[PDB]
Homo-oligomer: A and B are copies of this chain.
Amino acid sequence: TLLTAINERQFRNGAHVEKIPMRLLVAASNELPEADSSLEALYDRMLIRLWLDKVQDKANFRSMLTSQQDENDNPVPDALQVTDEEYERWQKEIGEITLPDHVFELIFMLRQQLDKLPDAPYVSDRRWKKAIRLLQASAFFSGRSAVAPVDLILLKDCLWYDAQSLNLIQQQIDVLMTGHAWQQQGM
Contact of A58 among B36, B108, B125 (CB under 8 A): B108
Q: Which residue of chain B has its CB nearest to the CB of A132?
A: B65
How close is A31's CB to chain B, nearest CB, in angstroms?
A: 7
Contacts A54-B124, A61-B108, A125-B54 given; indicate if A132 touches B36 (C-beta within 8 A).
no
Number of A residues, CB within 8 Å of B? 28
In the bound complex, what is the Cα–Cα distance between A31 and B38 (angstroms)?
A: 13
In the bound complex, what is the Cα–Cα distance between A71 and B125 (angstroms)?
A: 14
Specify which chain B residues have a CB less than 8 angstroms from the CB of A68 in the assembled complex. Answer: 95-96
- What are 7 inter-chain pairs, A to B, with CB distance below 8 A? A7-B71, A7-B72, A8-B72, A55-B125, A66-B99, A66-B132, A68-B96
Specify which chain B residues have a CB less than 8 angstroms from the CB of A125 in the assembled complex. Answer: 54-55, 64
Specify which chain B residues have a CB less than 8 angstroms from the CB of A95 in the assembled complex. Answer: 68
In the bound complex, what is the Cα–Cα distance between A184 and B71 (angstroms)?
A: 39
Tell me, yes or no, whether A51 is within 8 Å of chain B by CB: no
